[PDB]
Structure 1
Amino acid sequence: MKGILGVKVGMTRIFRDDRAVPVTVILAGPCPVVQRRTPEKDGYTAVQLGFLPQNPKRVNRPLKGHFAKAGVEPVRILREIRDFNPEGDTVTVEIFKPGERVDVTGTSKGRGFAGVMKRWNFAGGPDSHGAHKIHRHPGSIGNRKTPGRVYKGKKMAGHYGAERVTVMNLEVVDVIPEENLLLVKGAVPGPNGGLVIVRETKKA
């Protein structure tokens, strides 16, 4: 179990054996290790990783003390990868080889207040034949006096997207160590410029 903190760059398709391969390009490393969670100290096994250098004149005193115990620059982001104790003190794209499968976690695009048709693929109402101002409405939400109420987890309108989403078992198409680049076949959660977490796959 191994992982790294990335930046989603954009999408393209390359050619491999006369087939077009859609890809997402990810600027993964380099992530210096800032702290190690041990069973003796914290109760579990993980690496806290840094990512993106930060203006040292922008990082307050509590955080500076934290960076000093590890002797690293200020980094913009701090994220943990659980059950990973890498040997070195820095994690780069070369922990992945082309052909490995990875899971990627980002923050999906946010639709704000979403109707039930966009949120839950509901069918709405008809658009003619008498339909009276219900064209996008959820329909009925219950029964009658029994149970006289509405189920918890009922599918209704409300905020949608901008939620943590992991897509699983994506093939690593190429690794470019010189640019900290990681290629991955298919679609990755979130917008270009969004932070993403890349982990070795869990599907066997």
Structure 2
Amino acid sequence: VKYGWSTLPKRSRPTRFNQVTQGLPAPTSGPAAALKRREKTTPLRTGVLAVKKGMTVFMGRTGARIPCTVLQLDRVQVVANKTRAKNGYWAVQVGLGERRAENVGAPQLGYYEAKGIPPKQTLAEFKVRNQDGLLPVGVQLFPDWFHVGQVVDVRGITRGMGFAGGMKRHGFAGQEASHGNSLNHRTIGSVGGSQGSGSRVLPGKKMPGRMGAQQHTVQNLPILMVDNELGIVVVKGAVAGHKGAVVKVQDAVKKAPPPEEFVEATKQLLNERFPDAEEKLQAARKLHLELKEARRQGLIDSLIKNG
């Protein structure tokens, strides 16, 4: 085998021919089985991209003092929806920030050209439970997307620490300092047994190497403050990464989803702030073809200088 128990070649595509409507047992693996086992824990709504701006404390009006992190949402927009009939899973693609057109490549310039959205800085997907979590393309998500007291999960890239030793990377105790130790004060020590243990270093051995700059999730962080003007969403506790780093905020998976009334109110607010998200999208998709057909012919210069 190469991966798991499957000896099937890698270019074979037999999934459509083994159907459950033909009387076959539902497979235990595959996208369908994966989504059922994660149905309870998948969020109902999408998430937002925020930038870690710093740390502070929230002072209550009766004596409370709560450490918290300030996460700012900068021009967060919905860029695309991932359906189960086209991709195999439900998800919403969200954007953050802005970027100069010259830095954006032609493949991505046309990707936004067919949506009516300015080129974004980053993009990320947020898995949703079902089709009810898909949002219109081109709608901005504000801090009010969450409500005070709501628990969320913050995913971010930890602070890089370069090549770390055994003490910092794996909590090795080290060795003695003065009782005769020769050149072995912070070293890892022995790396395994002798002939009876394989005559080799065993896979999975904890050794020095690079540490940090990996994704880390913090679960169950309440929302202390929500300010739309400032664009910040204050959450209790710490968050992975450095200031100015992009993090992913979404409802907690180990907690009950937000009330039904809230999930509808937030969706009903996107229809008011942007009464026409489809009319502007269909017009953009109609312009992409006109420009895409001009690039093929080579008459794009005429359209640019038309008016």
Q: Verify same fold: TM over 0.5.
A: yes
1:98-151 deviation digits (Å, cap 9, x = unpaired)? 101111011101110000001011100000110111100111110110121122
Q: Which residue is 2:83 aligned to?
A: 38
Q: Which residue is 2:220 aligned to?
A: 169
Q: Which residue is 1:188 aligned to?
A: 239
Q: Any gaps of 5 or more consecutive residues in structure 2? A: 1-42, 256-307
Find the residue that maps to 1:70 and give its secondary structure: coil
Structure whose residues are more often helix by fraction: 2
Q: Which residue is 1:112 aligned to?
A: 162
- Contact 1:99–1:172 (CA under 8 A) maintained in structure 2: yes
| Residue identity opposite 1:85 in structure 2 | L
The TM-score normalised by the length of structure 2 is 0.64
**RMSD (Å), alpha carbons:** 1.3
Within 5 Å, which residues of 2 pair with 1:115-194? 115-146=165-196, 147-194=198-245
Find the residue that maps to 1:152 and give its secondary structure: coil
Find the residue that maps to 1:90 and give its secondary structure: coil
| Residue identity opposite 1:36 in structure 2 | N
Q: Which residue is 1:86 aligned to?
A: 135
Q: Which residue is 1:73 aligned to?
A: 118
Find the residue that maps to 1:65 and give its secondary structure: helix
Percent identical: 38
Deviation at 1:86, TM superposition (A): 3.0
Return the index of the structure with the highest Cα Rg: 2
Which deviates more from structure 2 when the two are superposed, residues 51-60 or residues 173-182?
51-60
Q: Structure 2 CA distance, aligned partners of 1:41 and 1:71?
A: 22
Deviation at 1:29, TM superposition (A): 4.7
Q: Structure 2 CA distance, aligned partners of 1:87 and 1:73?
A: 16
Deviation at 1:87, TM superposition (A): 5.3
Q: Which residue is 1:9 aligned to?
A: 53
| Residue identity opposite 2:168 in structure 1 | K
| Residue identity opposite 2:203 in structure 1 | K
Q: Structure 2 CA distance, aligned partners of 1:179 and 1:3?
A: 19
Deviation at 1:74, TM superposition (A): 1.1
| Residue identity opposite 1:8 in structure 2 | K
Q: Structure 1 CA distance, aligned partners of 2:79 and 2:101?
A: 16
Q: Structure 1 CA distance, aligned partners of 2:113 and 2:136?
A: 20
Deviation at 1:75, TM superposition (A): 0.9
Deviation at 1:90, TM superposition (A): 2.5
Structure whose residues are more often strand by fraction: 1
Q: Structure 2 CA distance, aligned partners of 1:133 and 1:9?
A: 43
| Residue identity opposite 1:97 in structure 2 | H
Structure 1 runs (4+) greater than 6 angstroms displaced: none
Q: Structure 2 CA distance, aligned partners of 1:197 and 1:59?
A: 22
Q: Which residue is 2:248 aligned to?
A: 197
Q: Any gaps of 5 or more consecutive residues in structure 1? A: none
Q: Which residue is 2:265 aligned to?
A: none
